[PDB]
Amino acid sequence: PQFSLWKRPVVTAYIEGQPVEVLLDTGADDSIVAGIELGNNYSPKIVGGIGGFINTKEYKNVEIEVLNKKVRATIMTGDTPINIFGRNILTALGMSLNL
Amino acid sequence: PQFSLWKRPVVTAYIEGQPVEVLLDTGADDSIVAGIELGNNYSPKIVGGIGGFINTKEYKNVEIEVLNKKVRATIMTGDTPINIFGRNILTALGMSLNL
Ligand SMILES: CC(C)CN(C[C@@H](O)[C@H](Cc1ccccc1)NC(=O)O[C@H]1CO[C@H]2OCC[C@H]21)S(=O)(=O)c1ccc(N)cc1
Ligand SMILES: [Cl-]
Ligand SMILES: [Cl-]
Ligand SMILES: [Cl-]
Ligand SMILES: [Cl-]
Ligand SMILES: [Cl-]
Ligand SMILES: [Cl-]
Ligand SMILES: [Cl-]
Ligand SMILES: [Cl-]
Ligand code: NA
Ligand SMILES: [Zn+2]
Ligand SMILES: [Zn+2]
Ligand SMILES: [Zn+2]
Ligand SMILES: [Zn+2]
Ligand SMILES: [Zn+2]
Ligand SMILES: [Zn+2]
Ligand SMILES: [Zn+2]
Ligand SMILES: [Zn+2]
Ligand SMILES: [Zn+2]
């Protein structure tokens, strides 16, 4: 698939079966999702964005389905205004930025 | 050129001739840089992300040299923690995000 970036590169995904809208974000190291409930097996993490820092819940080895692929990856849940798949997932998917 | 996303995609750009390192960010609609003064002809705007919001100043038709290309583009200035070249610049350069 190819994203020409005239529109946001947004897609739908499942995270442990939970449907989400996510932004493919080359500017993010991590993948941050709001709203989904992945349970109590997490570790707290601190994530910094353009405005400051948030606490997140880090879940390892989470099943994610996106772009017709299935991978395992780390998801952090917390208060992001847009759900983002960062480079930890983009690399698992084999994505690249090209010119 | 290809950015494989194992590392942050950061390159050196020249904005009105001054060198800045910038992050090539598909998750950003627009571009925001710190530490460079672009003057009194702007439109104030607020942008939001993780951690909250920041005040910015939006400048039009700014000279940018990056990835051996020269373009004229919209740039915001503000107290951003990292310099971001968002989709308005990536599309001017003809960049794409591919799987
Ligand atoms: C959260 C996204 C919807 C929007 N952001 C772009 C995003 O790529 C930022 C860009 C970014 C990068 C570093 C620092 C601040 C912001 N990355 C980010 O917040 O990533 C966080 C998750 O992974 C971690 O790795 C980097 C910071 C953490 S943003 O910086 O808030 C932003 C919003 C609007 C514009 N026009 C430009 C930038
Ligand atoms: Cl597009
Ligand atoms: Cl489009
Ligand atoms: Cl499913
Ligand atoms: Cl990281
Ligand atoms: Cl941490
Ligand atoms: Cl960690
Ligand atoms: Cl972080
Ligand atoms: Cl391909
Ligand atoms: Na003016
Ligand atoms: Zn398009
Ligand atoms: Zn499934
Ligand atoms: Zn949407
Ligand atoms: Zn991180
Ligand atoms: Zn992080
Ligand atoms: Zn971790
Ligand atoms: Zn030059
Ligand atoms: Zn400051
Ligand atoms: Zn392919």
Short mmCIF file of C-alpha atoms and ligand atoms in Angstrom, two decimals:
data_model
loop_
_atom_site.label_atom_id
_atom_site.label_comp_id
_atom_site.label_asym_id
_atom_site.label_seq_id
_atom_site.Cartn_x
_atom_site.Cartn_y
_atom_site.Cartn_z
CA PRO A 1 0.00 0.00 0.00
CA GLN A 2 1.08 3.57 -0.53
CA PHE A 3 0.28 6.81 1.32
CA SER A 4 0.89 10.01 -0.66
CA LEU A 5 0.45 12.23 2.41
CA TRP A 6 -1.91 14.78 0.82
CA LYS A 7 -4.38 13.32 3.38
CA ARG A 8 -3.49 12.02 6.83
CA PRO A 9 -2.29 8.41 6.62
CA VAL A 10 -5.10 7.08 8.73
CA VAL A 11 -6.28 3.50 8.66
CA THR A 12 -8.41 1.22 10.80
CA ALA A 13 -6.82 -1.50 12.90
CA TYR A 14 -7.70 -4.07 15.50
CA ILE A 15 -5.81 -4.20 18.81
CA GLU A 16 -6.58 -7.52 20.55
CA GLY A 17 -9.80 -7.44 18.54
CA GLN A 18 -10.75 -3.87 19.47
CA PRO A 19 -11.31 -1.62 16.44
CA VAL A 20 -9.51 1.73 16.24
CA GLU A 21 -8.72 4.55 13.86
CA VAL A 22 -4.95 5.07 13.86
CA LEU A 23 -2.50 7.54 12.30
CA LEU A 24 0.70 6.10 10.81
CA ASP A 25 3.21 8.43 12.49
CA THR A 26 6.88 8.42 11.49
CA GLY A 27 7.43 11.14 14.11
CA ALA A 28 6.52 8.79 16.96
CA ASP A 29 8.89 6.29 18.52
CA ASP A 30 6.04 4.53 20.31
CA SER A 31 2.42 3.56 19.58
CA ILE A 32 -0.10 5.31 21.79
CA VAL A 33 -3.83 4.49 21.82
CA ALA A 34 -6.62 6.07 23.89
CA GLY A 35 -9.77 4.47 25.06
CA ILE A 36 -9.07 0.79 24.56
CA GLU A 37 -9.02 -1.44 27.56
CA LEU A 38 -6.17 -3.97 27.62
CA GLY A 39 -6.41 -4.98 31.27
CA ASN A 40 -4.11 -4.95 34.30
CA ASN A 41 -0.92 -6.57 32.98
CA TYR A 42 0.97 -3.37 32.25
CA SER A 43 3.93 -1.32 33.40
CA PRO A 44 3.63 2.48 33.78
CA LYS A 45 5.64 4.57 31.32
CA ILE A 46 6.17 8.27 30.80
CA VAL A 47 5.73 9.64 27.26
CA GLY A 48 6.50 13.13 26.05
CA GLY A 49 4.77 14.92 23.20
CA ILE A 50 4.55 18.41 21.78
CA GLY A 51 2.81 19.73 24.87
CA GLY A 52 4.24 17.89 27.75
CA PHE A 53 4.26 14.46 29.33
CA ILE A 54 1.63 11.87 30.00
CA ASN A 55 1.56 8.65 31.95
CA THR A 56 0.81 5.59 29.84
CA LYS A 57 0.18 1.88 30.42
CA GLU A 58 2.63 -0.30 28.48
CA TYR A 59 1.39 -3.63 27.16
CA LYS A 60 3.86 -5.95 25.50
CA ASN A 61 3.23 -8.53 22.83
CA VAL A 62 -0.16 -7.23 21.85
CA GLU A 63 -1.86 -8.64 18.76
CA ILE A 64 -2.49 -6.02 16.16
CA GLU A 65 -4.15 -6.34 12.76
CA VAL A 66 -3.52 -3.53 10.32
CA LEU A 67 -2.93 -3.25 6.58
CA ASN A 68 -3.84 -6.86 6.06
CA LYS A 69 -0.95 -7.87 8.35
CA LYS A 70 -0.91 -9.41 11.83
CA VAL A 71 1.98 -8.47 14.16
CA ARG A 72 2.84 -8.55 17.84
CA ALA A 73 4.01 -5.26 19.31
CA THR A 74 4.09 -2.95 22.28
CA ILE A 75 1.09 -0.68 22.75
CA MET A 76 0.87 2.10 25.28
CA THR A 77 -2.57 3.25 26.31
CA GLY A 78 -3.06 6.81 27.50
CA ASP A 79 -4.39 10.24 26.70
CA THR A 80 -3.42 10.96 23.13
CA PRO A 81 -5.82 13.07 21.06
CA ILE A 82 -5.15 10.85 18.01
CA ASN A 83 -4.25 7.18 18.15
CA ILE A 84 -0.81 6.71 16.63
CA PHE A 85 1.16 3.77 15.31
CA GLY A 86 4.77 4.83 15.65
CA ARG A 87 7.98 3.37 14.39
CA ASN A 88 7.93 0.32 16.65
CA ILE A 89 4.90 -0.88 14.60
CA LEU A 90 5.87 0.72 11.27
CA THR A 91 9.11 -1.28 11.32
CA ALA A 92 7.32 -4.50 12.31
CA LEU A 93 5.15 -3.91 9.22
CA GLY A 94 8.17 -3.23 6.98
CA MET A 95 7.18 0.37 6.11
CA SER A 96 9.44 3.07 4.81
CA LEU A 97 9.42 6.75 3.87
CA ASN A 98 10.59 7.40 0.31
CA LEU A 99 11.49 10.25 -2.04
CA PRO B 1 16.28 8.40 -0.60
CA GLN B 2 14.67 5.88 1.77
CA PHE B 3 14.10 6.18 5.49
CA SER B 4 13.71 2.71 6.96
CA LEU B 5 12.25 3.98 10.29
CA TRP B 6 14.51 1.88 12.54
CA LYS B 7 15.80 5.24 13.61
CA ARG B 8 14.04 8.62 13.78
CA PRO B 9 13.97 10.13 10.25
CA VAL B 10 15.93 13.29 11.00
CA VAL B 11 17.67 15.36 8.36
CA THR B 12 19.32 18.77 8.13
CA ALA B 13 17.23 21.51 6.60
CA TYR B 14 17.94 25.17 5.87
CA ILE B 15 15.10 27.57 6.68
CA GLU B 16 15.71 30.98 5.20
CA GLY B 17 19.33 29.76 5.09
CA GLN B 18 19.70 28.72 8.71
CA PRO B 19 20.47 25.08 9.42
CA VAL B 20 18.08 23.17 11.63
CA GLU B 21 17.65 19.44 12.21
CA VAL B 22 14.08 18.36 11.42
CA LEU B 23 12.01 15.25 11.93
CA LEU B 24 10.16 13.96 8.81
CA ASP B 25 6.76 13.40 10.36
CA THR B 26 3.76 11.79 8.63
CA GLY B 27 1.80 12.28 11.85
CA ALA B 28 1.97 16.07 11.60
CA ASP B 29 -0.38 17.97 9.29
CA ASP B 30 1.87 21.03 9.29
CA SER B 31 5.42 22.02 10.17
CA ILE B 32 6.64 23.61 13.38
CA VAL B 33 10.15 24.79 14.28
CA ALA B 34 11.76 26.38 17.32
CA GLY B 35 14.64 28.76 17.75
CA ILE B 36 14.20 30.60 14.44
CA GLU B 37 12.63 34.05 14.11
CA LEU B 38 10.54 34.57 11.00
CA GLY B 39 9.23 38.06 11.85
CA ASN B 40 6.01 40.11 12.33
CA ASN B 41 3.88 38.83 9.48
CA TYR B 42 2.18 35.78 10.85
CA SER B 43 -1.19 34.41 11.92
CA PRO B 44 -1.36 33.05 15.50
CA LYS B 45 -2.71 29.53 15.81
CA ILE B 46 -2.88 26.81 18.42
CA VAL B 47 -1.81 23.26 17.85
CA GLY B 48 -2.51 20.18 19.96
CA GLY B 49 -0.79 16.88 20.53
CA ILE B 50 0.32 14.60 23.31
CA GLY B 51 0.69 16.51 26.53
CA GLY B 52 -1.46 19.42 25.47
CA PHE B 53 -1.33 22.48 23.26
CA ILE B 54 1.06 25.18 22.18
CA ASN B 55 0.72 28.65 20.75
CA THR B 56 2.33 29.05 17.33
CA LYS B 57 2.93 31.72 14.71
CA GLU B 58 2.08 30.65 11.15
CA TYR B 59 4.25 32.02 8.31
CA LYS B 60 3.50 31.57 4.59
CA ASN B 61 5.80 31.13 1.62
CA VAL B 62 8.97 30.33 3.58
CA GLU B 63 12.13 29.25 1.81
CA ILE B 64 13.10 25.67 2.71
CA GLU B 65 16.03 23.56 1.48
CA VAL B 66 15.94 19.91 2.48
CA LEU B 67 16.85 16.54 0.85
CA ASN B 68 18.59 18.34 -2.01
CA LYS B 69 15.34 20.12 -2.91
CA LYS B 70 14.19 23.68 -2.51
CA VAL B 71 10.56 24.52 -1.80
CA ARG B 72 8.42 27.44 -0.51
CA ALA B 73 6.07 26.38 2.27
CA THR B 74 4.09 27.22 5.35
CA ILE B 75 6.04 27.01 8.62
CA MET B 76 4.87 27.59 12.16
CA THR B 77 7.18 28.78 14.89
CA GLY B 78 6.64 28.00 18.55
CA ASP B 79 8.03 26.36 21.62
CA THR B 80 8.05 22.88 20.17
CA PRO B 81 10.47 20.43 21.76
CA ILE B 82 11.54 19.06 18.36
CA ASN B 83 11.51 20.55 14.86
CA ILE B 84 8.89 18.91 12.66
CA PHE B 85 8.48 18.82 8.91
CA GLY B 86 4.90 17.64 8.51
CA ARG B 87 2.86 16.62 5.53
CA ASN B 88 2.64 20.08 3.98
CA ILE B 89 6.40 19.88 3.37
CA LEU B 90 6.60 16.11 2.73
CA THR B 91 4.07 16.41 -0.06
CA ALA B 92 5.92 19.35 -1.60
CA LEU B 93 9.01 17.20 -1.68
CA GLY B 94 7.08 14.29 -3.26
CA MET B 95 7.60 11.96 -0.31
CA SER B 96 5.46 8.88 0.31
CA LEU B 97 4.90 6.36 3.09
CA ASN B 98 4.98 2.82 1.72
CA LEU B 99 4.35 -0.78 2.83
C1 LIG C 1 0.60 13.12 18.26
C2 LIG C 1 0.46 13.34 16.75
C3 LIG C 1 -1.01 13.19 16.31
C4 LIG C 1 0.84 14.80 16.42
N1 LIG C 1 2.26 15.12 16.68
C5 LIG C 1 3.27 14.61 15.70
C6 LIG C 1 3.93 13.39 16.33
O1 LIG C 1 4.71 12.73 15.30
C7 LIG C 1 4.87 13.71 17.53
C8 LIG C 1 6.16 14.52 17.12
C9 LIG C 1 7.03 14.70 18.34
C10 LIG C 1 8.24 14.00 18.46
C11 LIG C 1 9.06 14.16 19.60
C12 LIG C 1 8.60 15.06 20.60
C13 LIG C 1 7.39 15.76 20.49
C14 LIG C 1 6.63 15.56 19.35
N2 LIG C 1 5.29 12.43 18.13
C15 LIG C 1 4.86 12.05 19.36
O2 LIG C 1 4.16 12.67 20.11
O3 LIG C 1 5.36 10.82 19.66
C16 LIG C 1 5.25 10.38 21.04
C17 LIG C 1 5.02 8.86 20.91
O4 LIG C 1 6.30 8.29 20.61
C18 LIG C 1 7.29 9.07 21.28
O5 LIG C 1 8.35 9.37 20.40
C19 LIG C 1 8.39 10.78 20.12
C20 LIG C 1 7.60 11.46 21.23
C21 LIG C 1 6.61 10.40 21.74
S1 LIG C 1 2.52 16.65 17.29
O6 LIG C 1 3.95 16.75 17.47
O7 LIG C 1 1.68 16.77 18.46
C22 LIG C 1 2.07 17.89 16.14
C23 LIG C 1 0.75 18.29 16.01
C24 LIG C 1 0.43 19.13 14.95
C25 LIG C 1 1.42 19.55 14.06
N3 LIG C 1 1.09 20.39 12.99
C26 LIG C 1 2.73 19.12 14.22
C27 LIG C 1 3.09 18.29 15.26
CL CL C 2 -2.82 11.20 -0.34
CL CL C 3 -5.90 13.19 -0.84
CL CL C 4 -10.02 -9.39 15.44
CL CL C 5 11.15 4.24 22.45
CL CL C 6 9.32 5.51 31.12
CL CL C 7 10.34 0.75 27.75
CL CL C 8 8.56 9.22 24.81
CL CL C 9 5.38 -2.03 -1.62
NA NA C 10 1.82 42.00 9.56
ZN ZN C 11 -4.59 11.65 -1.74
ZN ZN C 12 -8.22 -10.63 15.11
ZN ZN C 13 -10.57 10.34 11.23
ZN ZN C 14 9.68 5.60 23.47
ZN ZN C 15 8.81 6.94 24.16
ZN ZN C 16 9.01 -0.46 26.46
ZN ZN C 17 21.53 25.94 0.38
ZN ZN C 18 9.91 26.38 26.58
ZN ZN C 19 5.16 -3.68 -0.31
#
